[PDB]
Structures are given as structure tokens and as C-alpha cells.
């Protein structure tokens, strides 16, 4: 194994607060309720922009191109 990543779960006020806030925000963001196809794509892009600097599909294409 080239890289080993050990993950520890420790109780910390600041870390717990930040993680809980992010998890709650993500859960609210993914709520199903929260041209027509173009409008859907635009709202999906707006939702994605919050948490990722690069579009996911563009990222997959980038990875494939770089590998090939």
C-alpha cells in the first residue's frame, strides 16, 4: 500500500461544531423539494458551485483526459 491514511474520531468542541454545521447544511442542500431542462441544469449548477470549485462531470472528463 503506497499511502496509509489513519482516521481518528476525537471529541473536540470546535471540530464537532464545524462538522455538525457542515453536515446540517449539506442535508438541507440535498432536500428533494429544495427551458425546463435548462432551468434544472442551472439550479443544479448553482447548488454545486457552493461546495465544489470544479464541475463534477468536468472533473471526470479531466481525469480521463489526463490519464489517457
Amino acid at each position: 500500500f503506497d499511502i496509509l491514511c489513519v482516521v481518528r474520531d476525537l471529541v473536540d468542541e470546535e471540530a464537532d461544531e464545524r462538522l455538525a454545521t457542515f453536515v446540517v447544511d449539506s442535508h438541507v442542500r440535498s432536500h428533494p423539494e429544495n427551458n425546463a431542462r435548462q432551468r434544472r441544469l442551472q439550479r443544479q449548477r448553482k447548488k454545486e458551485e457552493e461546495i465544489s470549485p470544479i464541475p463534477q462531470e468536468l472533473l471526470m472528463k479531466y481525469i480521463h483526459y489526463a490519464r489517457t
Binding site: L4, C5, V7, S52, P53, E57, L58, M60, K61, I63
Partner: protein, 193 residues
């Protein structure tokens, strides 16, 4: 010719699968490999079968599919929202966009930050995942020495530290991915049998 069978995921639980025979003409051959999950666009055709009639006792016609297009659905359940036969293929404009993105100084930081955006932290598990996804360059020195060019990663952590979600994201992003569980995998289910 291939034997198309209902995928385990879509068949009702505990019921026998149904199958059809798909005919692949020129330029379509070898595109689908056994054990894969594919979506087949074709023509639904029927023909007279004597043995069928004989066996059934009724005038029943055999059925086949003449493949028009094949889309590799294996490991692409979460990518069904896109369009095109291949979602990992690119156009010339997209290649220019890739070059423009790459020329940026902070490309690596953005790439790492874009790995599993829904997972809060673990910037050390995202860096390793990105490195594994991109991989290295295999080498063959003078045709005698072979050096591996892939990166393996192991996550040894606490029960609720978002490891399975990371694996699922890697499966979604990778061009060809396979997911297996601990005891669900046999010594020859991996490798070859």
C-alpha cells in the same frame, strides 16, 4: 451475438431473470465484454422458429434485438443523469477548457478540494484519493524490468469517519470501477476463475 440478461439490480427480488439475444454488426463487436452492465438501443425484431413452435405447440415467433448503440452502464449508476453514449469522452472545446484550467497555478488545490465535496474535512484522505485516481506512469526499462505505475491507498479509521462514502465517490468518478465487500468477495471472484 450476445446474451443480454436482466441486471440483478433491476430484477424483482427473488424472481428469475429474463433474457434476450442481441446481434452486434460491424463496428459494434467487442464493445461489450462479458459480465458488464450495458444499455442497448436497437430494433425489436421477430422471426419464425420451427423448434419453438414444436416445443410450445403454438405459433410463437422468436425475438431478437439488432443493436444500434451500446452504452457502458457498469459502475455508472450515479452518472445516469448525463447524455451521450460515453460520459467520459470529450470534445475539442472541452479539451481547450481543460488546458485553460490546467494552466492555472492552483489547479492541484482545486482538484483536491473537489474530491467528495460533501465530506467536511479529511484533506489527507482526499489528497490520497486524488493521487490514486490520477495514478502514475508505468515504466519498462530496456524491455527487461517492469515497474508498477499505480497507487494503492488504505483507509484504517474509526467507524463513522466517512470511508464508505469516499469509496462510493471514487467508484462514481473513476472511468472503470468495481466495488466489493469484505466477505462478499471470494479468492477467484477477484482475479480470474
Amino acid at each position: 451475438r450476445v446474451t443480454l440478461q436482466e441486471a440483478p439490480g433491476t430484477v424483482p427480488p427473488g424472481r428469475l431473470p429474463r433474457h434476450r439475444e442481441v446481434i452486434l454488426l460491424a463496428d459494434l463487436v467487442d464493445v461489450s465484454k462479458p459480465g458488464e452492465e450495458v444499455e442497448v438501443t436497437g430494433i425489436y425484431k421477430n422471426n419464425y422458429d420451427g423448434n419453438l413452435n414444436a416445443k410450445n405447440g403454438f405459433p410463437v415467433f422468436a425475438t431478437i434485438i439488432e443493436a444500434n448503440s451500446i452504452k457502458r452502464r457498469e459502475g455508472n449508476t450515479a452518472n445516469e443523469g448525463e447524455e451521450g453514449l460515453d460520459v467520459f469522452s470529450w470534445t475539442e472545446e472541452e479539451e481547450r477548457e481543460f488546458r485553460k484550467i490546467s494552466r492555472d497555478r492552483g489547479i492541484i488545490d482545486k482538484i483536491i478540494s473537489s474530491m467528495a465535496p460533501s465530506i467536511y474535512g479529511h484533506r489527507d484522505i482526499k489528497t490520497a484519493v486524488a493521487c490514486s485516481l490520477f495514478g502514475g506512469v508505468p515504466k519498462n526499462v530496456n524491455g527487461k524490468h517492469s515497474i508498477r505505475g499505480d497507487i494503492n491507498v488504505l483507509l484504517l479509521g474509526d467507524p463513522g469517519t466517512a470511508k464508505s462514502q469516499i469509496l462510493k465517490y471514487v467508484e462514481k468518478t473513476a472511468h472503470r470501477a468495481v466495488f466489493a465487500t469484505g466477505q462478499g468477495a471470494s479468492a477467484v471472484g477477484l482475479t480470474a476463475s
